[PDB]
Design a protein around this nucleic acid. Structure first.
Lengths: 51, 89, 62, 239, 150
RNA sequence: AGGGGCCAAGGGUGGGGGUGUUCACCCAUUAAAGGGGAACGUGAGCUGGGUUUAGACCGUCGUGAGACAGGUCGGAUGCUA
RNA sequence: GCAUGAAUGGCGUAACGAGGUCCCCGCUGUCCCCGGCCGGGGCCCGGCGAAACCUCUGCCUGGCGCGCAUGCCAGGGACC
RNA sequence: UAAGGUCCGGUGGAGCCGCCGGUAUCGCGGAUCCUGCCGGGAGUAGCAGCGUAGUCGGGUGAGAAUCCCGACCGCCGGAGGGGCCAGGGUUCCACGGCAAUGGUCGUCAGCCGUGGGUUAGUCGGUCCUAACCCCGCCCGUAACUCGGCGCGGGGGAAAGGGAAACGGGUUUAUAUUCCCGUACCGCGGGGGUAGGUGCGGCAACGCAAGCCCGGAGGGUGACGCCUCGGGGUAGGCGGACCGGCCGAUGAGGCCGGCUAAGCGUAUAAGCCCGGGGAGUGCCGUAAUGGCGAGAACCGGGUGAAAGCGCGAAUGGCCCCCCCGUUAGGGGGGUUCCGCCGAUCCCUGGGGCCCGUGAAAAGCCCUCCGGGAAUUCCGAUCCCCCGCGACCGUACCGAGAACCGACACAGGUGCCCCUGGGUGAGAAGCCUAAGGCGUGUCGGGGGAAACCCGGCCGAGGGAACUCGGCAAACUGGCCCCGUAACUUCGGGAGAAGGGGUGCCUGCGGGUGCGUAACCCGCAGGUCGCAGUGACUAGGGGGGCCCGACUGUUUAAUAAAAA
RNA sequence: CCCGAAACCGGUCGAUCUAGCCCGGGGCAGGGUGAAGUCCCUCAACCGAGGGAUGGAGGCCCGCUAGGGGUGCUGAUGUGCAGUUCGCUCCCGUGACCCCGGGCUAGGGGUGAAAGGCCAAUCGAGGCCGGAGAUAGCUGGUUCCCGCCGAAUCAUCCCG
RNA sequence: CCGAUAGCGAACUAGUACCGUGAGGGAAAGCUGAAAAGCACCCCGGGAGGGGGGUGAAAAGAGCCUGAAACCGGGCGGCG
RNA sequence: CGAGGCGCAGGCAGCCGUCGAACCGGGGAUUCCCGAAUGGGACCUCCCGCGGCUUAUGCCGCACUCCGGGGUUUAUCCCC
């Protein structure tokens, strides 16, 4: 099917997805150069996981 | 559908939509012949149907009128001869 | 098994190891029902050892 | 030194050496809670089946107190034969009675060794025990090996012979058909020889075909060294 | 920018035809570019800017002439043949065919009264036993006997 | 037509049959079918049959593991200067 | 029989084998003896772009020397 | 002497010396040192080898061989296409871009940025239980997060078992789920009537079921192997009619012509039942074979698929003639007859056996019936009111989303295995639906040497070499004929020899009436060659070893082991 | 002084690789040969003889069906496409066959049609951690300068 | 005592990124300036790229204090 | 403590605070799911047997294993 996620696993996948953003520009102003790179960036292909 | 392998509950009829899409459907397996069991013979006046279908169908099909619908009339043809001999003595 | 490693390796596909209900590391082996890291399923206790492993992360945390 | 041997694996009860118990069929019980004396008990052959792991045919019997149990099938049984259990069972084939109640010089099988333990003796295809002599003290019965064991007279047994004779009269034919039989039973196979097994694998025999030390082994020899002709009294076929 | 890659897939589902069959007018690329919706694609279908190629069919002429010729006993000499003898015609299958008529034949005759209950047994039984070639032969052999002929 | 000796390397000094064979044995030719050296010329050229891996067999030896320049089948030939 | 031999199996064997060895017929560039062709590389251009490894370097021959030298010694060749 | 000290200039823009006494994780050239940074190699190799693909106009943009549109030229054809399990995890979809990423460019994208999307009473999970597992308890152990038994309970298949649903429509993205239509599960009411808790028929048997808590029992759930035959229809193709098209001549060809799940009413070989009564004993099947424990033969009954109608004038195909910057539309007509040939699917026989081939949930029946019954009762019959606890659904599923660090020529399950031509064929080639030209770097030198794939070589016919290794030859099919040996089964497709095309005209078989195929025969005739292509065994003999088939050092040894 | 290996041992962690064992499923174009079994005709008193049919078995054959294996080319590659690949050729291809999912067996243990093979790029005893900075008579290295003196490479003993 | 190739695994986004089926293994990554004035306005450029002018001082102009060596371009001297 | 704050984190925007914030101490409220995880199983989710209560949804309290005491058909079964 689907497969075939468990509800929770989708919660976890969703979280990893959240971590896989790019910071916003304004924080960056607030910082005035700065913590960047966002360090977690996870690529779907590039990386695994956990499950 | 979700079953791919041609497993037993899987088995297939071709179905047409008019869309001309032509999609595969599963079919329910075709009926095994209930036995007398007291002597092995397929039973007259006893249905064939799919074991699910018998739930939502009629009971008339599921028996003959004579006692022990499960066994054949001739095997009952033994059993009464015995029952009386048993009441007599 | 030896070489021809590319030819071989279609399993791993199946998973036997996860984020654990108890610890959260990547070792709750679905098949055994045992976490390699924490020891959940196997024991009431957390896995901890003289060598250690578990301890090392904790000290490191301090 | 070398690994545990082929026999030592067996003993573990590990699964290559574990009998299936889920494709295999019932065991014999005669049941002594309704006793032999003050009998009550006849039954009807409900069906006859082949038991895979006995390599013999076996009977399901429907008793008239309402219990269903298997009894090892006699030759020349019909489905709807009545089998009786007790001493006041008729003296005929397939009927079960105590040894004392059974005549001398009649063929008998399924003999008890402790009264009321359900048959622990003569339960193979086509072979049979002979009642040679009977005395109220002890009844001596002659076993399939030619060898006489004394049993209590209040053991049960069934009159007749076992069914499924000729069993080794027909051959096994090929390695395929044989493979098929061993799955039906349990018997570690294909089984090779120790002689071209390496010195690690097995106590006797090296790289090439020749035995190490003598094949013939002690009766006080170790586990894992008790292979070959075990405690052989003689060997060969000559003076 | 200017997609159009989806718009083709979408058009494909509305038209219920293959992607490869879609014809977009070359003069009207700009108009299809501004097509975002299916409803737009549907407009463009009516205006004749989005069309379907015709589905081909392989010609059977060449088959037909062969089929007629093979129906007529031709193109089947020892030099066109590719399978072994039984292969064209299954030796069990033909026989399975052969015997049923010999039996129908006798059966027809059983109702007609021509042959007594007394000949038929020998004949029917003879048919299982392969004496008859068949229809012509059965007719001949009984005719020789006399009882058929009556 | 030889035997034996001197000068002389300019040129020539082969083809096959057995053998893993350098050697050697033989055949028919040939004018003659010479010898030796070059990492026992020549594997960042080939070939890889043999010698001396890991599989196996026989004989001998050895209690046995196991061995043999005894016999024997099989057993990879890397690199962009 | 340097140093065979009977269930540490002897002998023999139809059928069978991507097994070892030998012969014959057909066939055939394996060979006498190589040519031409074709397509992909090679080779050039444009864009893209690594590695192995790295004391140095225009030698050759002899002698010597750790006895198997571009570099010592003596000649010769020597423009990049 | 020197280890090292000191001064000037430039740079730099806050800390720093000397002496004396102390102290040490105290001085670096090597450690196939360790780490970090960097050059040559190179602007070289790779960006080729596998069935070798693009190309012209035009659109867009700063920039176009590789983005898009059309035309034109190809590959693919059980897959380079379609649907999916695992697994991945937003890769999906839209808009805006190109610094990086993509074996090259890039205006594209799977990258970057920013937004958005997976909706379920009737699909599956969930339930059952398997092989098997765990827990408590009993016990062991010095003891346990250890250990096997015996009890008692609980768990165990997203391809077993199993309640019930399809079609059409719509979305940028989802849909059997949202919508529309039609259908229906479970439970819970209500209202009627069969029902003095069913009437009516000799019988083989009739449906508008059988009041009821309870437990019991019994069938069906329910299972190994392979033929053959019987049925179903997905569906391939000729003829005829209706439109669309292409078009020397206006022919022939291409194309659209469809009917769902759910119901109602019908299934019928198996299998029973009456009548009758086995004469040299008869009869049947494709076949083995049945019969006096009921034949031959006549009437019945009885249980898979299948047809028709409902579902459905619809809807969905297919055209025509008008409205136009546009939007939203309108009116029309066709939407058909047969006969014929097939995978599979379902149903009987039958052959097999030193595998004799799990359970239960659930149904259906029956035994008993705790009680309620005549002011009655009950609802399997109808019809009708209400409701649906929970998780999953995107996309991919692959010679770029999996796994191999790589978008790796690898290799991992199913299903479409019956598209047309071919031909024994799920074979090759070609070709249709469908997909693609991103198995992602281009261009040039007629391109010489050399190297890989491959083609052809006179004469000679293994002289090569350890060795005919490699390669060649035979070749499909039909006919003839067929040795030694032999475990009589085989050897054997021995060997060797002949034939095979097209056309024109016949005959046979099966059937029904000229269908659908198949098997022969004669004449005429062309080529070098008729399996002309593709497909497609070289043969023969002695000897050694091992009986064979199988297995073996997964990855230098497949053998005699 | 510093570094340097093959071990050994103790406690742990793997059967998603792979081996066998078990449950429950699935896959395998087409073609050949033709056994038992059964039938008939003609000819014979019988003994049998000749012919033809029907049926359909096989650890069976052919086969580049799918799928499994991997013989030769000692070819192509050999800083690969690939840490075990490619094409032709070749073996098997209804089976002692292949395959999926579940489930079992763990390190002197398992498993093995048994090669010392296999048990997750690691097997004549896996991996991880600890003992552990093991210890080696053995290789390599051991860094500022200057001044002064300046060797022995012999003897006896020693599992040396 | 050490002082960012050092000292705690880790001066920080650390037990992170990442590896491994798992047990377990495991980095690197500190410095603007007085003030952010963190680059307006003007010229150029397809241009988010880059150059001139604009700060006490930009070898203080965005991992921005200093700013070595290897090494790379150009230029000067010399050789060629 | 007391006159600015709104964590690391200098942005933009807006906000709060004398009826005294931020902050510090003490006390209190809320404190998901999994976890010894205790009703049962699980791949961090799901199902279920009682009893209380609101008309219903909602909501509140409970049933693994010892010891101590009860209840009763003394089912060793259930309750504090």
């Amino acid at each position: 099917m689907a497969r075939n996620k468990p509800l929770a696993k989708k919660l976890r996948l969703a979280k990893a997805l959240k971590q896989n953003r790019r910071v916003p520009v304004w924080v960056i102003v607030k910082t005035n150069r700065r913590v960047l790179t966002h360090p977690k960036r996870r690529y779907w292909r590039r990386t695994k996981l956990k499950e | 559908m979700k079953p791919m392998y041609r497993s037993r509950s899987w088995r297939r009829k071709y179905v047409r939509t008019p869309g001309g899409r032509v999609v595969i459907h599963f079919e329910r397996k075709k009926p095994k012949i209930a036995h007398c069991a007291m002597c092995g013979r397929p039973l007259n006046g006893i249905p064939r149907g799919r074991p699910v279908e018998m739930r939502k169908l009629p009971k008339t099909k599921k028996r003959p009128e004579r006692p022990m619908p499960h066994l054949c009339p001739r095997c009952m043809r033994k059993v009464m001869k015995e029952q009386i001999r048993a009441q007599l003595s | 098994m030896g070489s021809g490693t590319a030819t071989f390796g279609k399993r791993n596909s199946t998973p036997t190891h996860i984020r654990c209900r108890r610890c959260g590391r990547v070792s709750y082996n679905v098949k055994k029902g045992y976490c390699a890291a924490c020891g959940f399923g196997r024991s009431r206790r957390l896995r901890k050892y003289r060598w250690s492993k578990k301890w090392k992360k904790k000290k490191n945390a301090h | 030194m070398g690994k545990s041997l082929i026999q030592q694996r067996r003993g573990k009860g590990s699964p290559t050496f574990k009998s299936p118990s889920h494709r295999f069929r019932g065991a014999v019980k005669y049941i002594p809670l309704n006793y032999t004396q003050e009998k009550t008990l006849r039954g009807v052959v409900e069906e006859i089946m082949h038991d895979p792991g006995r390599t013999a045919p076996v009977a399901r019997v429907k008793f008239e107190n309402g219990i269903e149990k298997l009894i090892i099938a006699p030759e020349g049984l019909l489905v709807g034969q009545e089998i009786y259990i007790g001493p006041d069972a008729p003296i005929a084939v397939g009927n079960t009675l105590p040894l004392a109640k059974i005549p001398e010089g009649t063929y008998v099988y399924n003999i008890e060794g402790i009264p009321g333990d359900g048959g622990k003796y003569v339960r193979a295809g086509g072979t049979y025990a002979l009642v040679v002599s009977r005395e109220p003290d002890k009844v001596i019965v002659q076993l399939p090996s030619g060898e006489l064991k004394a049993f209590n007279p209040m053991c049960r047994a069934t009159i007749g012979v076992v069914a499924g004779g000729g069993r080794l009269e027909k051959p096994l034919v090929k390695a395929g058909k044989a493979y098929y039989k061993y799955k039906a039973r349990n018997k570690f196979w294909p089984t090779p020889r120790g002689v071209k097994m390496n010195a690690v694998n097995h106590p006797f025999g090296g790289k090439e075909h020749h035995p190490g030390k003598p094949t013939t082994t002690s009766r006080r020899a170790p586990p894992g060294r008790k292979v070959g002709h075990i405690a052989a009294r003689r060997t060969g076929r000559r003076k | 920018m200017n997609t159009l890659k989806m718009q083709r897939r979408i058009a494909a589902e509305i038209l219920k035809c293959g992607e490869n069959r879609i014809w977009i007018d070359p003069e009207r690329i700009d108009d299809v570019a501004s097509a975002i919706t299916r409803e737009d694609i549907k407009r463009l279908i009516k205006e004749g800017v989005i069309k379907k190629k015709p589905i081909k069919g392989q010609s059977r002429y060449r088959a037909k002439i062969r089929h007629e010729q093979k129906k007529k006993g031709r193109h089947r000499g020892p030099g066109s043949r590719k399978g072994k003898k039984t292969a064209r015609m299954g030796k069990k299958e033909l026989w399975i065919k052969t015997i049923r008529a010999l039996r129908k034949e006798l059966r027809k005759l059983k109702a007609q009264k021509k042959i007594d209950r007394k000949t038929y047994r020998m004949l029917y039984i003879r048919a299982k036993g392969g004496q008859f070639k068949n229809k012509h032969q059965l007719y001949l052999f009984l005719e020789e006997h006399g009882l058929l002929k009556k």
